Amino acid sequence: GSPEETLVIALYDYQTNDPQELALRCDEEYYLLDSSEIHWWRVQDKNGHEGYAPSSYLVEKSPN
């Protein structure tokens, strides 16, 4: 239960200022890709949209 990839939940509706960031929705979650880093958490939407996301305005969801 640690494929180096989990899901997160956006506490607040964070918007993207460029293809670099990923638009987040309140209550919604995304696919965590690069969690090892620390500067910025990389997330991916089920639509194939990825971008840097603030790990601060969100929390880990873990599998199951």
Beta bridge partners of 31: 7, 44
**Of 5, 44, 4, 42, the residue nearest 28 (C-alpha):** 44
Helix (H), strand (E) at residue 20: none
What's domain 1-64's architecture? Roll (2.30)
Length of the chain: 64
DSSP category for residue 21: B
- Around Cβ 43, how many Cβ atoms within 10 Å? 26
Distance, CA of 42 to CA of 36 (rounded, Å): 10
CA 33 to chain centre: 8
- Around Cβ 36, how many Cβ atoms within 10 Å? 8
The residues spanned by each domain of the chain are: 1-64
Task: Check: CB of residue 42 under 8 Å from CB of residue 62.
Answer: no
> How was this one solved?
NMR
Degrees, nearest 5: CA angle 10-16-18: 150
